[PDB]
Amino acid sequence: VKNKCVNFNFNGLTGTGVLTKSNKKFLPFQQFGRDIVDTTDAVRDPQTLEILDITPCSFGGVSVITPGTNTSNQVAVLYQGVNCTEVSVAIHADQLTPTWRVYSTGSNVFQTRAGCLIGAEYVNNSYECDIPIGAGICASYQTQSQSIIAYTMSLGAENSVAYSNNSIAIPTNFTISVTTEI
Amino acid sequence: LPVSMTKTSVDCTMYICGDSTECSNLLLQYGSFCTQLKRALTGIAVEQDKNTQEVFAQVKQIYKTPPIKYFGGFNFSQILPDPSKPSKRSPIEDLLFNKVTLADAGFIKQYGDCLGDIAARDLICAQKFNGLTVLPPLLTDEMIAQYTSALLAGTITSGWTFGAGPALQIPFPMQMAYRFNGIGVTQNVLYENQKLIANQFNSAIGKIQDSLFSTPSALGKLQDVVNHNAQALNTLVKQLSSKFGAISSVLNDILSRLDPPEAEVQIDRLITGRLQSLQTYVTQQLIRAAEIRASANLAATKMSECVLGQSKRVDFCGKGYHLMSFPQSAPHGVVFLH
Amino acid sequence: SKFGAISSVLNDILSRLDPPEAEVQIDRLITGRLQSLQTYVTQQLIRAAEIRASANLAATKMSECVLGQSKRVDFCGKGYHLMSFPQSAPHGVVFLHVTYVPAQEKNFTTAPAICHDGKAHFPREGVFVSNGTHWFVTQRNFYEPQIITTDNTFVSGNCDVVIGIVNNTVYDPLQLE
Amino acid sequence: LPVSMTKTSVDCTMYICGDSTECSNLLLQYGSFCTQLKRALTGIAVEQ
Amino acid sequence: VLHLTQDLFLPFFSNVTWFHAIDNPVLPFNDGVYFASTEKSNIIRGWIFGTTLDSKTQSLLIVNNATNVFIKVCEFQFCNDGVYSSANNCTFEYVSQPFLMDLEGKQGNFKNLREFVFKNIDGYFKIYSKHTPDFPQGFSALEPLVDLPIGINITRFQTLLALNRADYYVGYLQPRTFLLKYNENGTITDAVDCALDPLSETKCTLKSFTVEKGIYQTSNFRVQPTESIVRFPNVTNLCPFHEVFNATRFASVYAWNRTRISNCVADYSVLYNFAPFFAFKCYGVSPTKLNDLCFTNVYADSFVIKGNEVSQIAPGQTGNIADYNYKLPDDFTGCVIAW
Ligand SMILES: *[C@@H]1O[C@H](CO)[C@@H](O[C@@H]2O[C@H](CO)[C@@H](O)[C@H](O)[C@@H]2O)[C@H](O)[C@H]1NC(C)=O
Ligand SMILES: *[C@@H]1O[C@H](CO)[C@@H](O[C@@H]2O[C@H](CO)[C@@H](O)[C@H](O)[C@@H]2O)[C@H](O)[C@H]1NC(C)=O
Ligand SMILES: *[C@@H]1O[C@H](CO)[C@@H](O[C@@H]2O[C@H](CO)[C@@H](O)[C@H](O)[C@@H]2O)[C@H](O)[C@H]1NC(C)=O
Ligand SMILES: *[C@@H]1O[C@H](CO)[C@@H](O[C@@H]2O[C@H](CO)[C@@H](O)[C@H](O)[C@@H]2O)[C@H](O)[C@H]1NC(C)=O
Ligand SMILES: *[C@@H]1O[C@H](CO)[C@@H](O[C@@H]2O[C@H](CO)[C@@H](O)[C@H](O)[C@@H]2O)[C@H](O)[C@H]1NC(C)=O
Ligand SMILES: *[C@@H]1O[C@H](CO)[C@@H](O)[C@H](O)[C@H]1NC(C)=O
Ligand SMILES: *[C@@H]1O[C@H](CO)[C@@H](O)[C@H](O)[C@H]1NC(C)=O
Ligand SMILES: *[C@@H]1O[C@H](CO)[C@@H](O)[C@H](O)[C@H]1NC(C)=O
Ligand SMILES: *[C@@H]1O[C@H](CO)[C@@H](O)[C@H](O)[C@H]1NC(C)=O
Ligand SMILES: *[C@@H]1O[C@H](CO)[C@@H](O)[C@H](O)[C@H]1NC(C)=O
Ligand SMILES: *[C@@H]1O[C@H](CO)[C@@H](O)[C@H](O)[C@H]1NC(C)=O
Ligand SMILES: *[C@@H]1O[C@H](CO)[C@@H](O)[C@H](O)[C@H]1NC(C)=O
Ligand SMILES: *[C@@H]1O[C@H](CO)[C@@H](O)[C@H](O)[C@H]1NC(C)=O
Ligand SMILES: *[C@@H]1O[C@H](CO)[C@@H](O)[C@H](O)[C@H]1NC(C)=O
Ligand SMILES: *[C@@H]1O[C@H](CO)[C@@H](O)[C@H](O)[C@H]1NC(C)=O
Ligand SMILES: *[C@@H]1O[C@H](CO)[C@@H](O)[C@H](O)[C@H]1NC(C)=O
């Protein structure tokens, strides 16, 4: 069986990996396939004489994003470095290691470059970054009546200089400011 | 100048005991030993993001160049953004981005094509198979170019005033007159040899791209950073095939071959070796992070002093008497044009 | 932590095993504690190096901002630097940078030079500013409009090479008296 | 101001297993635990 | 302190099976049973534990009464209702204070709630209780009473009733990580699970009841395998077992014919289907665990003898056929065939 995470025990090689079709050029005397860093990569099926790859099942990490618990109790979950379509189907078939299940209402699905976020909605405005998520995406708790959104951070207030070839601006006043460094 | 390094979040149990309950249980006995390694890697990642922020986000407002480009005859096309390019990068940015090759991009979501690799799976897939991952930068390589464009378009239409308070406009010939006056030679010489200074400026800007294009490696610093990180990751992966003085080097077949109450010793030796290897990786990463942090602090100071004003300390902003500087973005670094 | 031994209390393992086998067990605890001590001391060395770098920066900042005023930009606070005051904090220092920040500004006009009679006149310090009708001289960082005098304008030029030059009259306090 | 330090070139094979083939073979099982040390020392020397 | 422990605990916000009374299903037991009951004075007398509930395996009796308890582990036969009818091979008798505490402030409105939790990890039957005078939300810890090393098998749990002329909040414990906040005077005012909600493990990861705004890397996720294939190479090349078991001129015992067996794969179903057989006495090899053993060389000797000589062929024997024609070594490992 192919195209599924399956515990294999090929000819004594125990492990867990996704198996599929490949276009290697295994010579007639070859059985295994390895890499530069010496990991078993492609295994010629003994009873199929074909070429089948091995791939990490779904190695990632879970990060929970939330405002302060004294303000609210809601949370959102981000799965590091995996198109959430795979995690979505995996939730739907119930084979993820984390037993905690965050809600999927359809409005909370966002494919970032850092994974895919679930539990928050995409507003297309731009504000100062509050909770750094990754790859130019920030999230924040904002009154609607309250929820957690996803947006792209704004680099700053938009301004344009008025440059001209014979015009200057000269200050007519001043102010004195006291900053601090620690 | 390098500014930041690739960001990694290795995880103990997946690295050290491939999905083995007994091996994880025996790893648990060592207390919060590998917890320090995690916290350390998280600190490294946050430091990298902060380094990029300090170096580049020096201005609070994004200015934009005027539609026309005629600054008294001076030529800045080679450095200002080029609208035709989809990435919106200057040609000097483009040469820099095309001369640097990254082993692991990180923002690829390469999962899904490791099964479809057809040929032997590469470094990225091999690393991902043993619980080793790379996180993407918070600020993409695109908005860094936008920060650089704002800094560039503030320098050539307002002088050094935008770095202190409000931006005040002033013609580029007058700005250059004051920059000449700052090095002890009066503005008269500029108002007499405007044409010669413009022509020399153009010629220098023209030949810098040839100097960068023809050289074998003038970008050696960033490339060494990338190569060192990739080599460290490869030597971390390669240790899982080392026997470390036991029967075998693989947990899956060490458990499938020997029973718990006698394979306990073998699992313990494997645990010791792999834990020490992870310790070494983390310590070297900490030292390299300190070095890159020092370099990033120097780069931030150099930007703040040479770009938003002209410096008097000698041989700091280039050999000779300083007049200007222009920033350009590079992969995991910055480039100054003194 | 047991570190792969019988127990994590040295005295406890002693009263339940023969000395030779107990010694075997004893080594396991010692090695784990040693590796722990090595980790602690190495991280302490890293932290001490970073603190020393910060302390050197603080010493330099104290010396330059407090015992004088600096021309380095964005070093002793944002803006044009005026003063600095030190304060003491637990395991650190706190500076109070006093800076001068400009204020409300106005588009005026400008001129690279002014050609009175065949000669280009330039402002010793400052810019040439036209209100819109009359030409004057001023500073850069503050607006103090002043009548055009030769005392503020040195003469060197020929009124033919300055791109964007304009025209007006210049004044001297010498021909009047 | 100090500017540099002495450049050491320790070699693990002779340091750990004085000219003994059995100890060399046993040390060979601990992975590449020596090439990293040699690389670090060489980098330090070039830096000096 | 905010001690975080790993032990068999009833899951938080998990469902519990609330029964009524007015026929007492024998609920299972696995990794502990959490108990609860609220009542006016008393309707529950005793408990019985174990598997098969009969006089063949060991079971448990902890029945209370007005003043004391009756803790014992015995082999009670049946009650079907005077709670037992068998105490032949039974021991482990213990007596102590009664488990039921009831107090009333001159009114029955103080329906004290009785939460009970037990376990038998490495035996050692632990007993706990706590009475607090749908289901209350305010937390309540549990205090231990007795700790006894029973060391028997437990699969099912039963509760007895009382007589008269709303309870049974029954849960189960699992190996779970819990975080418990302890007072300055040593009570437990709260507890939070570590595998129920993202916020729960978010608190457990930093072991702090208050979490500030931010994003925290908590755990690692992994798609567990959907199925498990095992695949091994192909098989062929059988032996001449049909050619040795179906000859026509089996030699006499005075010259026992020896056939050498090599270079095959060993089909052993033919050793079963061939003939109704008369003797299958194996000595050194289990007759069913023989397909899982690998041999270097095998010999097969075939001859004909009488009926008594068949039983005579055995390690360490005597007679005219075991001393003059064929001798079998005492340390022989194999199987004999006779039909
Ligand atoms: C320059 O800017 C100052 C503020 O930074 C002005 O000071 C203000 O003065 C008003 C009264 O005129 C006060 O009410 C106020 O609190 C503040 O001190 C100052 O007037 C201004 N001067 C000019 C010439 O614009
Ligand atoms: C300013 O610098 C530009 C750098 O790109 C010059 O553009 C050039 O355009 C010519 C054709 O017009 C190309 O052949 C060449 O490769 C380059 O892209 C530009 O001409 C130059 N002009 C001035 C005013 O200095
Ligand atoms: C030109 O610059 C002059 C500054 O001295 C301004 O003239 C002023 O005009 C008033 C009366 O209109 C005089 O009383 C005063 O002494 C001063 O000269 C004038 O506003 C300015 N013109 C423009 C167009 O900015
Ligand atoms: C300033 O005034 C000068 C005369 O006082 C101008 O010079 C003149 O230039 C014209 C041609 O432009 C000649 O025909 C004339 O003889 C005289 O040389 C000068 O152009 C003027 N400058 C500006 C900017 O108006
Ligand atoms: C732990 O035990 C202490 C002694 O019983 C409690 O202090 C008491 O507080 C009561 C009032 O609550 C006083 O009346 C009494 O004199 C004594 O000081 C203490 O509160 C308790 N800790 C708790 C309840 O958290
Ligand atoms: C394995 O053996 C079976 C039975 O002889 C045969 O049908 C099959 O093709 C064999 N497979 C291979 C790959 O040799
Ligand atoms: C993962 O990302 C998307 C989302 O489904 C999809 O194109 C595919 O499954 C994966 N893409 C790549 C580039 O691996
Ligand atoms: C609005 O947000 C959607 C995503 O919800 C995005 O696809 C779209 O481009 C946004 N439009 C604007 C104008 O920002
Ligand atoms: C200034 O003058 C030059 C030369 O005539 C012209 O090309 C440029 O467009 C002018 N600047 C503006 C802002 O119009
Ligand atoms: C000068 O005039 C332009 C006109 O668009 C304006 O945008 C700019 O702010 C002015 N400069 C000032 C007010 O300093
Ligand atoms: C308890 O059982 C009910 C079915 O009656 C189910 O809906 C619920 O999810 C269960 N509890 C938990 C915590 O799953
Ligand atoms: C209650 O149980 C105890 C347990 O030994 C027993 O001695 C006593 O007789 C029983 N009856 C009463 C009324 O206490
Ligand atoms: C107790 O068990 C032993 C087991 O051999 C048995 O001999 C004895 O008869 C039993 N006692 C009874 C049944 O009373
Ligand atoms: C307990 O009973 C179960 C099923 O009745 C059985 O599988 C298990 O081996 C028993 N344990 C002991 C210690 O007898
Ligand atoms: C021996 O072989 C013959 C044919 O070769 C067959 O008819 C006979 O049944 C076999 N003997 C037994 C006992 O099956
Ligand atoms: C078994 O009998 C055959 C035929 O009589 C003979 O060729 C062979 O040598 C005999 N094997 C012995 C006696 O071991």
Numbering used by the authors:
A (entry chain A): 534 to 677, 689 to 726
B (entry chain C): 727 to 1064
C (entry chain A): 968 to 1144
D (entry chain B): 727 to 774
E (entry chain A): 47 to 68, 80 to 138, 158 to 209, 215 to 246, 263 to 436
Could you pull the original sentences from the published paper?
The dense glycan shield consisting of 22–23 N-glycosylation sequons per protomer is an essential feature of SARS-CoV-2 S architecture. The glycans have been shown to play intrinsic and extrinsic roles in protein folding, modulating conformational activation and immune evasion. The transition to the ‘up’ state exposures of RBD for the binding to hACE2 is also a prerequisite for S-mediated viral fusion, directly correlating with infectivity. Here, we dissected the role of N354-linked glycosylation, acquired by BA.2.86 sub-lineages, as a RBD conformational control element in attenuating viral infectivity.
